[PDB]
Structure formats: structure tokens, C-alpha cells
Design an enzyme around this catalytic site. Structure first.
Site, PDB file in Angstrom:
ATOM      1  CG  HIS A 280      13.348   1.071  94.347  1.00 16.49           C
ATOM      2  ND1 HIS A 280      13.810   1.213  93.639  1.00 16.49           N
ATOM      3  CD2 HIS A 280      11.411   1.355  94.555  1.00 16.49           C
ATOM      4  CE1 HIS A 280      13.247   0.290  92.488  1.00 16.49           C
ATOM      5  NE2 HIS A 280      12.548   1.260  92.472  1.00 16.49           N
TER       6      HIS A 280
ATOM      7  CG  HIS B  14      12.909   4.315  89.151  1.00 18.07           C
ATOM      8  ND1 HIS B  14      11.262   4.441  88.681  1.00 18.07           N
ATOM      9  CD2 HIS B  14      12.712   3.914  89.987  1.00 18.07           C
ATOM     10  CE1 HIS B  14      10.479   3.906  88.744  1.00 18.07           C
ATOM     11  NE2 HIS B  14      11.021   2.746  89.855  1.00 18.07           N
TER      12      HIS B  14
ATOM     13  CD  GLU C  19       8.674  -3.608  94.517  1.00 14.42           C
ATOM     14  OE1 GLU C  19       9.314  -4.305  95.151  1.00 14.42           O
ATOM     15  OE2 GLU C  19       8.851  -3.117  93.296  1.00 14.42           O
TER      16      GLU C  19
ATOM     17  CD  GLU D 128      34.203   9.426  95.300  1.00 16.81           C
ATOM     18  OE1 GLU D 128      32.257   9.563  95.169  1.00 16.81           O
ATOM     19  OE2 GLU D 128      34.551  10.006  94.017  1.00 16.81           O
TER      20      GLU D 128
ATOM     21  CG  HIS E 142      12.457  -1.114  87.924  1.00 22.12           C
ATOM     22  ND1 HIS E 142      11.022  -1.867  88.088  1.00 22.12           N
ATOM     23  CD2 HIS E 142      12.087  -0.025  89.162  1.00 22.12           C
ATOM     24  CE1 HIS E 142      10.392  -1.322  89.167  1.00 22.12           C
ATOM     25  NE2 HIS E 142      11.417  -0.891  89.864  1.00 22.12           N
TER      26      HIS E 142
HETATM   27 ZN   LIG Z   1      10.705   1.478  90.760  1.00 15.57          ZN
END
Ligand SMILES: [Zn+2]
Ligand SMILES: [Zn+2]
Ligand SMILES: [Zn+2]
Ligand SMILES: [Zn+2]
Ligand SMILES: [Zn+2]
Ligand SMILES: [Zn+2]
Ligand SMILES: [Zn+2]
Ligand SMILES: [Zn+2]
Ligand SMILES: [Zn+2]
Ligand SMILES: [Zn+2]
Ligand SMILES: [Zn+2]
Ligand SMILES: [Zn+2]
Lengths: 274, 274, 274, 274
Positions: D141, D143, D117, D171, D212
Site C-alpha cells: 500500500h 500513497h 492496515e 504496457e 487515499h
Molecule cells: Zn494509507
């Protein structure tokens, strides 16, 4: 020489209470654990017992437990803290010759006393000793989250509750073929709830206290913790299934019967008949 | 010299079993793990095998596994305890020249024996060796909580179940493009359930035991644990979504096809067709 | 000599914040903790205070807290990090002779300041000192997950909310017989929310901030953490029960009354009357 | 001399990846993390870079990142393993003078390469550098379980999704006043998904990949992890509330406006208008 804190039984009490804390089963002082020892277990450590004795009377005489040593968790004590200070949170007690009371041989420092659920513990030990020809040695109580939740939704009936738990994980019938006893809600910390629990312990290794928690019995700390963990795992599965709208399929009666036959256990007839 | 307990394979077995314990997948003795080794893996440690041999016959001859060493978890043993006493809870076994039985070369102390699910393990290793030209080396079974819950609600059908799991996390199709096999409920610990599992292992790397748990296969401990963790993560997402009343949107068929093309995998046709 | 980081109070702050982090109650900087000390607690460590003094005015004079030392968590600080760098994330402060401000005696390194919720903390300490004849010493705020979820579904009413929490775990009435105060949603970090919280602290040891979190008060870190853990455990049970479609049975009014009598507590009349 | 593994940035990468693993956000290789460094950060460790250089071309030239060093997670690597072998699972890379590729200065041992990624990461760093005048330094990133579940039920619309997340913990509006961008489902690991993510990063610090996971940006590892943890905590609350049948009350528009004013932030107008 070996410190008593490094003994198999102190280490085991630390492991079980810490594991139960990590499970989320024992908020605050919500839980208690008692383990029956042999004289031979504590004899090597007797210089640790060398004491201004503390003696506490039992609420009810327990002649069957005469002369019997136990390691126990304390009243108002946190399972979370057992690992931090075993002697503050645990005690070794010995029931006297007549069963009228016990000495605190070690631990429960700063005037601490055994769990407020001692009647439920000691009376259950008595019944489990009789039920298992002396093989059961542990009584564990905790606040197992999913089992507690299920007591608000499943009928408070031994057959129905046992049957759902058997259905919610295949190994349940093998681990607790005698099923799960269930009391009505009762005020805790009393002789009455102790005696009600012990009467169910005659015919089951697990007993539910609705809206409160669970009691389990077994031969070792691991087997007793594992018994509760098995029932609670099934309860966790069931809570998910019921939250998704209920079962579309499940383990059949015939399948449960086949399971019992294979593992050489006689499943509780009332639960099997549903 | 290196203690066998510090070997890559003993350390790996400890990591996988401990991780699975921490996940809540392996209450009591609910789980088993077997890892196929090379002679070259265990050769440096052979002074540890120096033994009053223990030999145990297999329930069924397995000539394809002749001369093959494995490290395995024990019957009645707790994943929680592997880290505390590897030699008590794990054993190194070697299948003999004819595949009729195995020697216990190391571990499984105090008369312990390999997992009761050895047929499912060894038969699955056989099929996975054939299916992957010898690349798969691990069979893992645990009681993955959300996968278990889903078996009470989703149709017990390979295509339907595979398709929902693919939809419940994008990477699922990439990690298990062959999908998930699913058996009817069967009495566990038998040759029959072993053979049923192995037959599904011919065409899938994951096999579900309804109301019980999951079996996974892969080339390494991490890839096998990761395979199960991926399916179980998708199951966890699905349980949340179904508990919220179901999907309003999802990954489309066309999108799954595009995903397969990009990652160079051929997704199970039956699941893709839905 | 003992490092101040090894003091009972620094170690206790580390334990409570780390435990709360592990519970999932304190994402990012979402939580704050203040503990009232005696001069005698900090006196042995005074060489650590030996300082370019930092003085910060209070938003409102607090004459009742004149001369009083506290250990506190910092503004913008993560509960997760307290164990990694106690002096960065915690500070020892002392309210001055008039209650107009405080000195930072130790910690809150690199120009860090006490929690933005200091008004809610200090004003609540004031009211709890009065309410308990100086026995309460801790105010804890966190973002207890299930309690927060319940604020979107249960009526935001002290009697109703208290009563459900009492029903959701037997020991709740014993641990918080005065029940749970509940504010309307308010902008946080203000004098107004501080004063609203403190006014509820006059009559309850727990106060809910809808869509935000909980404040608790008690005599020790463990008893305060345990109070919150008890309410949050009951909330967790209730969230499961409500997700399964609601209670089929529960603890009755009469049973709650009996419980209060046995434990020598006077349960909040409004909650008991439902 | 200080080992590079003891550097603030290697230690920080270990902490963030391990914490995310413990959260259940990063099964298998499901997650990636990149941190932009200064030359001054890595200069003291340059004897570690002393290398048979490895050079890898970028899929797209990135002149804005010319000469810029990063520490990054590897393709196919497990967040769980970063703590066990930082040099196997992490690499220090430096984008070359033209932005056409990068050298691997340290780590990613045994021919490992940066995350698949990388386009989404590097393109997002570019946009966040512009959006924040160089203050943002991290792209993360993972999950995140509840955020993922919500993408199957909430409309995949920035205003609607942002507004629910703001409502699900007080918040949230303060931590992400610019709200949450949301893409349609896209095939991952592509230039296209990278460019779509980066375009949303122009106007939001959080971007959702339906079915995802999530991308987050911030100035430090803790602030970026904390951003994701905040959104995911709100998502967790919402999943519970929706599972209980939905909100009976919530934070009002007017209340959100008041919150924004107090904290000196301009909340995303589209989400605020609902
Ligand atoms: Zn991922
Ligand atoms: Zn209890
Ligand atoms: Zn003696
Ligand atoms: Zn019975
Ligand atoms: Zn199993
Ligand atoms: Zn040899
Ligand atoms: Zn199949
Ligand atoms: Zn807060
Ligand atoms: Zn001084
Ligand atoms: Zn009130
Ligand atoms: Zn150099
Ligand atoms: Zn946008």
C-alpha cells in the site's frame, strides 16, 4: 601533498555541476560554469601545471582579465560527468598578459576546450567585476526548466518578468533586488549573444535567454547557484499557479516596497512601479 | 568518546535538513529548523562547549525559555550544506537564566549566528510548550512548493484552507486535526511576524506564510518533518486536481466527521462546518 | 586482471540504465538498451565467455550484423536492478557468421534472454550503421514521461512534432536536426514494430511510439542518453507551457533557420517549413 | 553466519520501502508492506527468534494463514527510516496454528506493532492466495500521488478508471489485464475497509482507495512495486494530458484487444467494452 582534485575550487565545481544535474537543469551539454580564481588559490598546486602548454586565442581581446585564472567547464561536456572525471570535464585556464588568449594549465584532457559560451562568460565576468567592485566571481548558465517555460508565456520585458518572479516567492526581491534582465532570442555560442548578456549584467545579476535558459552571477559558487535556485523556485511556483488559472491574491506593490526597506535594498524601479 | 557530530541530535538535524533540501523545499537559505534539547542530552558532550563563550541578546526577553538548550540552523546558511559541515551550519545555543539572551556553546563557526527567524522559532516554542504540556520540541520552517502555490489561489482563511488540505489526502485530518493557521503576508525576519506566528501556534501545529512558506511544530524531528510532508503532499495532490479543472468528487463532511471519531480527534470546527 | 563488470561497457550500461531509472523513464521492465561493441572491446575478457554456449535464433536473419558483439538488457528485467546485479540483467551477445542467431557469451544468468524488443533494436542498428557510415553504436528505448504525454495532444506527424520540440528548447534543432520520426500506435514486441521503427531510423535519430515511449540512436551511451534527455526536456517545457494555456511567443522559423546555419546542420525541411 | 538483516527478505523490504520513499509515495507513515515467507526462508535465521515471545491476537481469525510467516512494516513507522533501522521498522511475524493471532519473532523493537492496515493486508493475502493458486506473496500500500489525484476527477468506477489507465501507457493492459478495483471512500484502519479491499482483490491485482492511495499484489517485491509503478506512471501521464486539456488521440478499443491477444491475456471485459 594535496591533489588538485581535492582543492576547494575543484570540489566546488563538482558540487555545483552535480547539484544542477540533479535538478534537471542540465541535460546533455546544456549548461556551463566559470569561476574566477586568485593566483594564491592555484599557486599551491602549480606542479600540476607543468606543462606542454596549450594556448587558445580569445575571439575578442579582454585586457581587463589579463593574468586572471579561472576554472571552467568544457565544450560538449556533460554536467552529469564532472563528478566522474573532473580533469576531463573541467579546466584551469589563465588569461595572458594582454588578454588576447589563455593557457590551459590543467584539465580538459584529450584536446578538450572550454565551453562554447566563453564569450558570454568572460564578458559577463568583466561587467560584474566593474558592477560589484570585484566581489562577483562566478558566472553560471543552465537550462532552468520553469524559467524556460515562463519565457513562452510572460511578456519578454525586464519589469514584467522581474515583478512576477518577485511575487512568486517572498525572498526573491531580497536575493535579486536589481531584477532579471531579458534578451530577445539570439543564436547561442556567439560573440553577439555574449555581448548582449554582458550588457544586461551591468544592471542585473540574472539574465534570461528566452526559450533557452538563464545566466547568473555571484561572489561564490553557493551564492550563484542559490540565486538561480531562488529564481527557478519562484518560476516553479508561478508555473503551478498559472496552470491552476492564475493568482487570486499576491504580494502587493506596497508590501514589496516594505520588504525592500527592511532588507536595505533598492528594488528595480520599473518592476516596482507595476 | 563520542564526537558531538555523532550525537542523536546533530545526526537528526543533518537528516531533516538534507531530506528537506532533497524535497526542493529549501533553495538557498530558505528554511530554518530549531530543536529544543534537555540538559541531559548535551551534558555528555560538555567538553565541546569549552569556550570563549559567545553571547547574543534576544530581541525580546523570553523568561519561559530560561536555561533551555537548543540546536539551531544558522543565518544565511544552506540546508544543502548541513551534511557537509554541521559545525559551520548548526549551533547549540543555551538561553540564559533570565531569558535575555543565549550563549553559543558549539558550532556556528566563523562568527555565524542563529537563523534570522529566531523570534518566530523561540516564540512558537513557547506557545507550543504551553499548548502541549511540554511535548512539542521542534519548530521547522521551509518553502514547501505546493503549499506556497496554493496560497495564490485558495482563500487565505484558516477554515477554507484547512478543509481543502483535509480533503486532499485522507490522513490529513488525523495528522493535523487542529488545522492550519494562516497569516496575511508580512515582512519576514521581524518580531511582528514571529509574534503573529506564535499566536497561531496556540491553536494549530501548522502555520502558513502566504507567498513564502510554512511553519510546523511537533514532538520529534521525524514527526515535525512528517507533519509538513503530509500537508505538502495533500497540497501537491490539490495542485494537480485544480490544474485538471477541479474536483468532481471528494471526501464529504460526514466522512471527515466519521474519520475524526474513529481516530479519537476533535477536528477544527470551522473547517468541519463547511 | 580486470573483472568484466569493471569494463567500460558494463560500467556504461549500468550508468545509463541507472540514470534512466532515476529520471522516472523506466518503470518495471519498461525500457531496453543495446550497445554495439568491437571484437577488440571484448577480447581482453574472453575467459569470461567460457562457456556451455547458449544460442538463440533471431526472428529474422540479419546478415549485416554477422559476427557483431553487443551488450544488451534482458527481457522482463528492471533498469532499477542493473546496478545491483549486472550479470543477471545484462548480457553480452554475438551475432553468428550468417546473422541467423546469436550466442550469449556472458550474463543473462538463470536462463534470462535479451529484451523482447530485440527486432526493433537490431533492425535499427542496421539502418543507423548505413545512415551514419558505422558511427552510431547505441539504440535506447525508454518511457520518457513528457514525450509520452505529448503524443496524446500533438498531431502524430513528424513535421508538427519535430517543430514543437525544436521550439521547446533552443539546442533541440542542433542535437536532432533530422527531427523526430513518429509511428502510429502498434502492438509492441513484434517484428512489424521493429521494422517500422527501423524504417524511420533511416531518416531520424529519434522515433516516437505514441502512448508508449521513444527510441534514440547515437555514437555513444552518453550521446544517446543525452539525445533522449534533450527531447524529453523540451517535452517537459512544452507540457508546462501547454498547461499554462499555450505559447504567447516562441522561436520563429527565421530564427530556427539562422540556428541551423550557425551550427552547420540541415534541419528537416518539412518541420522548418511550418 | 549471516545476520538476518542481510537476508534476501530484509534487504528486499529495505529496497522496496526506500524506493517508494524516494518516489514521494510515502510521506510520514503513509504506506505499508507485507511479504509472505516460507518456513524455509526463516529457518536458517531461527537463532534470531529466540525469544520472550510477543503474541498479538488478530481482529478476525484467519485460519487460511495458519502457521504462515510474514515480514511486515510497523504501525506509525516511516518508510524513510527502514534503511536506517530495519529491526525498529520491520518485524517478522508468524500466524499461529489456528489463525487467531501471531507471534512477533524478530524486529518491531521497543514495543512496536505491525501496521494498522494488517486486516487489509492479511485478508488480501488470503484472497490472492486463492486467486493465484499461491503465487502472489506481497501486498503493498502506498500513497501514489497521481493515482490519488485522479480519484478526484475520474469516475470512481472500475471500468472507466481501468480503461483510462490502460490508455495512459501501452504496457498497462499487459501488466494488469484484470484491471483496477475501486472502493468508495472508507474510514481506514478498519476491518470493514480490509474486507472491502480483499473482496476486490478476488478479481483485481490493484485496488484504489479514493482520496487515499492504492493497494497492489504480486509474486515478488519487484513485481508488486513494478505493478504500482506502472499504474502510477500511467496516472502521471494522464494528469499531464488532462492538465493540457485532454486527449486528442489515444489507444483504440481495437488496439487494446489486439494487444491482449498478442500477450495472451484476457482483458477485463467491462473496461474493454467502453
Ligand atoms: Zn494509507
Ligand atoms: Zn545553454
Ligand atoms: Zn609551475
Ligand atoms: Zn536590464
Ligand atoms: Zn522562509
Ligand atoms: Zn563544561
Ligand atoms: Zn487560527
Ligand atoms: Zn517500452
Ligand atoms: Zn575464449
Ligand atoms: Zn520520417
Ligand atoms: Zn528457534
Ligand atoms: Zn472489481
Amino acid at each position: 601533498m594535496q591533489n588538485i582534485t581535492q582543492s576547494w575550487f575543484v570540489q566546488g565545481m563538482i558540487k555545483a555541476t552535480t547539484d544542477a544535474w540533479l535538478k534537471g537543469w542540465d541535460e546533455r551539454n546544456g549548461g556551463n560554469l566559470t569561476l574566477r580564481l586568485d593566483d594564491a588559490d592555484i599557486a599551491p598546486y602549480h606542479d600540476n601545471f607543468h606543462q606542454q602548454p596549450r594556448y587558445i586565442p580569445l575571439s575578442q581581446p579582454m585586457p581587463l582579465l589579463a593574468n586572471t585564472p579561472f576554472i571552467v567547464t568544457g565544450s560538449g561536456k556533460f554536467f552529469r560527468n564532472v563528478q566522474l572525471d573532473p580533469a576531463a570535464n573541467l579546466g584551469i585556464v589563465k588569461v595572458d598578459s594582454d588578454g588576447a588568449g589563455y593557457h590551459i594549465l590543467w584539465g580538459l584532457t584529450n584536446e578538450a576546450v572550454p565551453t562554447s559560451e566563453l564569450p558570454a562568460h568572460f564578458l559577463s565576468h568583466c561587467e560584474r567585476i566593474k558592477a560589484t567592485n570585484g566581489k562577483d566571481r562566478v558566472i553560471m548558465h543552465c537550462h532552468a526548466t520553469n524559467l524556460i517555460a515562463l519565457t513562452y508565456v510572460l511578456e519578454n520585458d525586464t519589469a514584467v518578468f522581474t515583478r512576477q518572479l518577485w511575487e512568486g516567492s517572498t525572498e526573491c526581491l531580497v536575493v535579486f533586488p536589481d531584477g532579471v534582465g531579458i534578451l530577445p532570442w539570439m543564436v547561442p555560442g556567439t560573440d553577439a549573444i555574449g555581448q548582449a548578456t554582458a550588457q544586461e549584467m551591468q544592471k542585473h545579476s540574472l539574465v534570461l535567454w528566452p526559450f533557452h535558459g538563464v545566466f547568473g552571477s555571484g561572489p561564490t559558487l553557493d551564492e550563484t547557484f542559490g540565486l538561480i535556485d531562488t529564481a527557478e523556485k519562484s518560476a516553479q511556483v508561478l508555473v503551478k499557479v498559472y496552470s491552476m488559472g492564475g493568482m487570486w491574491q499576491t504580494i502587493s506593490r506596497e508590501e514589496l516596497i516594505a520588504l525592500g526597506k527592511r532588507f536595505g535594498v533598492t528594488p528595480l524601479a520599473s518592476a516596482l512601479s507595476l
